[PDB]
Amino acid sequence: VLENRAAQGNITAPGGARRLTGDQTAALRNSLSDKPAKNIILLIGDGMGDSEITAARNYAEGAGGFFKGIDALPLTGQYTHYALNKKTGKPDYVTDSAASATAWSTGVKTYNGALGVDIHEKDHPTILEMAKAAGLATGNVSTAELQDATPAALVAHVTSRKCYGPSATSQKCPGNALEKGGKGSITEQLLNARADVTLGGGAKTFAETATAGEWQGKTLREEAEARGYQLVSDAASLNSVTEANQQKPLLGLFADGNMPVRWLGPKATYHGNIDKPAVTCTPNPQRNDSVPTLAQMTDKAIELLSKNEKGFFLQVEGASIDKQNHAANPCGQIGETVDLDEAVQRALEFAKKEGNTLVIVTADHAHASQIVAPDTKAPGLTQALNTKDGAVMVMSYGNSEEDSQEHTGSQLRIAAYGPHAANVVGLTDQTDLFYTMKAALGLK
Amino acid sequence: VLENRAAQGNITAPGGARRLTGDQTAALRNSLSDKPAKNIILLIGDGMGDSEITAARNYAEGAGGFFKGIDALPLTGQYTHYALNKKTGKPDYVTDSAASATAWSTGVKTYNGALGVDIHEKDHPTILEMAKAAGLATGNVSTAELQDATPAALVAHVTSRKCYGPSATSQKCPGNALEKGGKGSITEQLLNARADVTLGGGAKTFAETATAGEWQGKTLREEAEARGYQLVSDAASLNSVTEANQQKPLLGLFADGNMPVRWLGPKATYHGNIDKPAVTCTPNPQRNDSVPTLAQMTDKAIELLSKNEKGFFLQVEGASIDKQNHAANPCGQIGETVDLDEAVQRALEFAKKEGNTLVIVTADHAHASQIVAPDTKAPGLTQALNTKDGAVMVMSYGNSEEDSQEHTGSQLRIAAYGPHAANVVGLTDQTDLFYTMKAALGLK
Ligand SMILES: [Mg+2]
Ligand SMILES: [Zn+2]
Ligand SMILES: [Zn+2]
Ligand SMILES: [Zn+2]
Ligand SMILES: [Zn+2]
């Protein structure tokens, strides 16, 4: 299980493409622990199936390369992530962002759109919740708006992922409407859960005013204030933070909607690989250096959370890999996958020094992107890219005639490292994750 | 390291969709072994990626089901399979059957179309060739033409996979043309290789006559006989074989071209899931009860080969999963995947009983099929299918406007069971497989 999996030499020569330097049996044995996990970090690469991991590596590190973080986890497996059809209760083979996040955080399958509720619209506790119960610290970082499905699944129990704040809930989730005696909108339930560290975007929703409860009349941000939440808005004030706890919880909103993608590149187009020049991704000028990178947020969050002796549970989401995959933008997608990789490196570094940390990197569901031959005449959107190898790689998006390339139901890679990582091996189900995390922590 | 990975109960209830009944740690620990593997069975599902395995499972077993074979191998990982560009020597991200086949059977990357040769055209010994030299028994069974890329890669070193027999070789691989003093076509080199058990289709090439050497004038089929080969053409005669060895090698040719596929169903069409009704596959009425099945051929081979005291190496190929994926034909593709799974079961059953066998199941490269949502208005070819769940599943084939769908470069699953199976876990390269087997067997 040598943690260096790049090609061993000259890929044109016998044995030069090999990634293994020796027999793993001994090494793997030594990486298998029954011992309890003290902390847990779950990295979700949104829409990061094996094709996205492959394409991003080929570009960033070259075909024979190797992601120091993403590719460095010793225990691997694949898992099913199908959802349920609300009415019939039958499987719906292509899950969305909300139906899936609910399963690893809850342990029960649900219909597309549901956050923290089963098909009967019944609530079930999330793992961030139970953790907090047991005494552990909790954090939730993301590069998308916190109201989005992935960060939200940990804290809200809503009937529709679209009920971000007071305005939308009153009409899409009337039974969750605060005025209707419901727990409140995603943003409200988030502010109630009070995880120790929460970072992402979606500041806009915090501007809506609450309609019931104590803080009626006051915007959600003012409520955050009145409730002891420290609010940071940039890289700067973030490092300025020295503690985050139940009386000093940190809440960082680094963008109105989602944060900006790191790379800029043209959108894939019809016969783009043929009628258009190969592209080389460049950095995104719209992104300011004050907006912290996912790795910075992961780092600070790990820093603040590692003080609680009981341990901690942290969930990091490289949100936009899924975003740009829908947008048919190979460069944005790849940049984002590299970004998550840096994030995982930080996780893996802490995990490695600490010893009792269980790191898990996976995705919520597959997506559109496919790596095809350079001469492909495909019916979808395509584009040619100049990889690190000095070769051309062509990516293809061909499952939607609409403005957005759809998700896919193929099972995808799941990798873990640490205490109890052995349960991530083989075929499992996305729900098993919830049970795997809960027992590694001894959550009950 | 469980053998039952099925959902455990009602998938709508909490933990009902779970596949893990406990903690794999000790189970896996107990499956890690480095003792020498006396035998090796390599089951290759042509173009069978994680999307292909998922669709077939969703269909034949239902979303929460599980393949008694394909899904029961405890050790898992993902491997890359990029090819090389002949001139540049740089990676060619999307390999073909020959380059890939050549990688695992030799340990050296090569350009696409090559069999047994590196990019400089130098021949390198295959794992079958080294097994035979070490005294082991060798078997190569496939559901397609024996001259095809996958089975050929083990017995031939040719510059073009198209060099099937005397003719094609004269004009495409003249340097290999026997007349030009070369080793000969794929068919000719196959008869020279003399593995104890060789089974598949592609008998129409054996009808060509050699141009030189001892058997010039004679058809390759006659040469086969003349050289002491037992010729079986159907199930009955196959089952009748009492022994297969170096003095009594078995040659089974069950079809002119590829053997017939198991299932039938229409080809996917533009907007097929919209304009058309759901499909339900039916068995192929063209398939003569007399044509043996992959599982049957896998079984006999195992029976005849398991007689050599030293041990054996067998390679099995579910050829048409790929051919049907190309042909945008779900029913044929899924059927062929169900077919490989039966053969896998036969392998695993032997493996568990014997206890010193290493069984590996994977694919040469990823393919085109995608599992998309029912209302997907895709730009390519789609089709709706009635799955075991009584739910509807849509499959999309949207990477080519030609009459053929293409392979893809995404890294794909590889699973193993037995001595040295731990060398599959994590990220590895397709060439590493060669080295894993070579070490497992003790080939020098
Ligand atoms: Mg998300
Ligand atoms: Zn998603
Ligand atoms: Zn999405
Ligand atoms: Zn192939
Ligand atoms: Zn093919």
What are the structural domain ranges in chain B? Answer: 1-444
CA distances (Å), B279 to each of B51, B66, B256, B325, in order?
19, 22, 30, 17
Sign of the C-alpha dihedral computed for residues A35, A36, A38 and A42 taken in this order? positive
DSSP state for residue B180 in the 8-state scheme: T
Note whether A372 and A54 are within 8 A (CB). Answer: no
| Partners of residue A362 on adjacent β-strands | A44, A414
Going from the Cα of B372 to the center of ligand 1, the distance in angstroms, rounded, reads 19
First to last CA, chain A: 32
Q: Which of B431, B436, B441 to mutate to test the interface with A (most CBs of A within 10 A)?
A: B431
For ligand 3, the distance from its centroid to the CA atom of residue B377, given in whole angstroms, is: 16
The residues of A assigned a catalytic role are 97
In chain B, how long is the greatest CA-to-CA distance?
A: 71
Catalytic residue, candidates B31, B33, B51, B97:
B97
Q: Which two tokens stand for residue B241?
A: 């074989």
Closest alpha carbon to B343 in B153, B141, B150, B151: B141
To the nearest 10 degrees (0 to 180), the angle between helices A127-134 and A186-193 is: 20
Token duo for residue A430: 């996305």
Exposed/middle/buried for residue A51 (C-beta within 10 Å: 0-12, 13-18, 19+): buried
Handedness of CA B374, B375, B379, B382 (dihedral sign): positive
B51, closest residue in chain A (CA to CA): A410
Cross-chain CB nearest to A431 (options B15, B27, B28): B15
Look up residue B170 and give its two tokens.
């004269």
Q: Which residue in A18, A34, A425 is closest to B429 by CB distance?
A: A18
Q: Kindly give the distance from the C-alpha atom of residue A213 to the centroid of ligand 5, in angstroms, as a whole number.
A: 63
Is A137 within 8 Å of A117 (Cβ atoms)?
no
CA distance B165 to B145: 12
The region, left, alpha or beta by phi > 0 then psi within -120 to 50, assigned to residue A426 is left
Q: Is B128 helix (H, G, I), strand (E, B) or coil?
A: helix
Partner-chain contact A34 B23, CB within 8 Å: yes
Pick the residue of A429, A434, A435 with the most B CBs within 10 A to test the interface with B by mutation.
A429
How would you list the strands of the sheet with A370-372, edge to edge?
A269-270, A381-386, A392-397, A370-372
* Cβ atoms B16, A413 nearer than 8 A: no
Residues B329, B330, B333, B336, CA torsion sign: negative
Give the max Cα distance, chain A: 72
Do residues A200 and A143 make contact, with C-beta atoms less than 8 angstroms apart?
yes
This entry's atomic model was obtained through: X-ray
B267-285 burial, b at 16+ Cβ within 10 Å, e below that, comes to ebbeebbeeeeebebeeee
Please indicate whether, in this complex, the C-beta atoms of A400 and B389 are within 8 angstroms of each other: no
Question: What would the 3-class secondary structure string for chain A be?
Answer: CCCCCCCCCCCCCCCCCCCCCCCHHHHHHCCCECCCCCEEEEEEECCCCHHHHHHHHHHHCCCCCCCCCCCCCCEEEEEECCEECCCCCCEECCCCHHHHHHHHHHCCCCECCCECECCCCCECCCHHHHHHHHCCEEEEEEEEECCCHHHHHHHCCECCCCCCCHHHHHHHCCCCCHHHCCCCCHHHHHHHHCCCEEEEECCHHHHCECCCCCCCCCEHHHHHHHCCCEEECCHHHHHHCCCCCCCCCEEEECCCCCCCCCEECCCCEECHHHHCCCECCEECCCCCCCCCCHHHHHHHHHHHHCCCCCCEEEEEEECHHHHHHHCCCHHHHHHHHHHHHHHHHHHHHHHHHHCCEEEEEECCCECCCEEECCCCCCCCEEEEEECCCCCEEEEEECCCCCCCCCCECCCEEEEEECECHHHHCEEEEHHHHHHHHHHHHCCC
**Candidates B118, B387, B423; nearest CB to A20:** B423
- What is the Cα–Cα distance from A191 to B240, expressed in whole angstroms? 75
Contact B218, B209 (CB under 8 A): yes
- Residues annotated within the binding site of A are 46, 148, 150, 317, 322, 326, 364-365, 407
Contact A50 B50 (CB under 8 A): yes
Give B49's contacts in chain A (Cβ within 8 Å): 410
Residue bearing tokens 């592209």 = A279
Main-chain phi, psi angles of A385, to 5 degrees: -130, 150
Q: Tell me if B25 and A33 make a contact (CB, 8 A cut-off).
A: yes
For chain B, report the end-to-end CA distance as a whole number of angstroms. 31
Out of B28, B103, B109, the one facing A12 most closely (by C-beta) is B109
Neighbours of A15 (CB within 10 A): 19
Say if the Cβ atoms of B391 and A118 lie within 8 Å: no
Ligand in nearest proximity to the CA of A407: 3
Considering every ligand atom shown, identify the ligand nearest to the alpha carbon of residue A340 and give its number: 1
Backbone angles phi, psi at A291, to 5 degrees: -75, 115
- Hey, what's the torsion of the CAs at B125, B126, B129, B133, to 10 degrees? 60
Contact list in B for residue A370 (CB cut-off 8 A) is 368, 370, 399, 408, 410
Order across the sheet with A137-145: list the strands: A230-232, A250-253, A197-201, A137-145, A312-318, A39-45, A357-362, A412-417, A75-80, A426-429
Residues of chain A contacting residue B14, judged by C-beta atoms under 8 Å apart:
106-108, 118, 124
The two three-digit tokens of residue A323, written as one number:
């975003």
Task: For residue B124, say whether it is annotated as part of any ligand binding site.
Answer: no
CA of B259 relative to ligand 5 center, distance in Å: 16
Identify all chain B residues contacting A24, using CB atoms and an 8 Å cutoff.
422-423, 425-426
Could you tell me the sign of the dihedral formed by the alpha carbons of A405, A411, A412, A418, in that order?
positive
CA atoms A38, A44, A49, A51: torsion sign: negative
A-to-B residue pairs, Cβ atoms closer than 8 angstroms: 339
Beta bridge partners of B117: B123
- To which residue do tokens 């009983």 refer? B353
Burial class of residue B312 (count of CB atoms within 10 Å of its CB; 0-12, 13-18, 19+): buried
Burial class of residue A242 in the structure, from the number of CB atoms within 10 Å of its CB (0-12 exposed, 13-18 middle, 19+ buried): exposed
Contact B12 A109 (CB under 8 A): yes
Q: Residue A20: CB partners within 8 Å, gap ≥ 6?
A: A2, A5, B423, B428, B432, B435, B436
Four-CA torsion B205, B193, B200, B119, nearest 10 degrees: -80
- Looking up tokens 């898990």, which residue turns up? A360
Contacts of B368 in chain A (CB under 8 A): 370
* A376 CA → ligand 4 middle, Å: 17
Q: Which residues of A touch B33 (CB under 8 A)?
A: 25
Asked if A91 lies within 8 A of B426 by C-beta distance, the reply is no
Q: Decide the pairing of beta strands A137-145 and B83-84.
A: unpaired
| Alpha carbon of residue B133 to chain centroid | 24
Q: d(Cα B275, Cα B294) in Å, to the nearest integer?
A: 36
Q: Of A102, A100, A96, A166, which Cα lies nearest the Cα of A128?
A: A102
The torsion defined by the Cα of A363, A365, A370 and A371, in degrees rounded to 10, comes to 20
Rounded to whole angstroms, the Cα distance separating B147 from B201 reads 9
Residue A87 backbone dihedrals phi, psi, to 5 degrees: -65, -65
| β-sheet bridge partners, residue A248 | none
Burial A376-403 (b: 16+ CB within 10 A, else e): bebbbbbbbbebbbebbbbbbbbbbeee
Q: Of A328, A304, A306, A332, which Cα lies nearest the Cα of A318?
A: A332
Cα angle value A85/A89/A95 (rounded, 5°): 35
Q: How many CB atoms lie within 10 A of CB B356?
A: 14
Header resolution in angstroms: 2.5
What's the CATH number for B1-444?
3.40.720.10
Q: Which DSSP category does B23 fall into? A: -
Closest alpha carbon within chain A to B89:
A12
* Long-range contact pairs involving B213-222 (C-beta distance under 8 Å, separation at least 24): B213/B178, B213/B184, B220/B165, B220/B187, B220/B188, B220/B191, B221/B253
Task: Kindly report the backbone phi and psi dihedral angles of residue A420, in degrees, each rounded to the nearest multiple of 5, phi listed first.
Answer: 75, 10
Q: Where is B80: in which H helix or E strand? A: strand B75-80
* Token duo for residue B62: 């239902």
**Nearest partner of A51 among A397, A382, A400, judged by Cα:** A397
CA distance A356 to B270: 53
Closest-CA distance, B8 to chain A, in angstroms, reads 11
Task: Please state, in angstroms and as integers, the Cα–Cα distance from residue A372 to each residue in A52, A61, B286, B407, following that order.
Answer: 13, 18, 34, 7
Which residues of A sit in the known binding site for Mg(2+)?
Answer: 46, 148, 150, 317
Phi, psi dihedral angles at B261 (to 5 degrees):
-75, 155
Strands A381-386 and A269-270: antiparallel
With an 8 Å Cβ cutoff, are A124 and B379 in contact?
A: no
CB A161 within 8 A of CB A155: no
> d(Cα A304, Cα B209) in Å, to the nearest integer?
78
| A5, A72, A75, A359, B423 from A66: Cα distances, Å | 6, 8, 16, 18, 17
Question: Is B105 one of the annotated active-site residues of the chain?
Answer: no
Angle at A299 between CA A295 and CA A305, to 5 degrees: 140
Q: Tell how strand A91-92 and strand A83-84 pair up.
A: antiparallel
Cα(B415) to centroid(ligand 2), Å: 27
Residue B340 DSSP SS3 = helix
**Are A104 and A42 spatial neighbours (Cβ–Cβ below 8 Å)?**
yes
Report the SS3 class of residue B429. strand
The response to whether B367 counts as a known ligand-binding position is no
Phi and psi (nearest 5°) for A143?
A: -100, 5
For chain A, breaks with the C atom over 2.5 A from the next N come after none
Distance B427 CA to ligand 1 centre (A): 25
Phi, psi (deg, nearest 5) at residue B83: -105, -170
Nearest to B23 among A25, A396, A423 (CB): A423
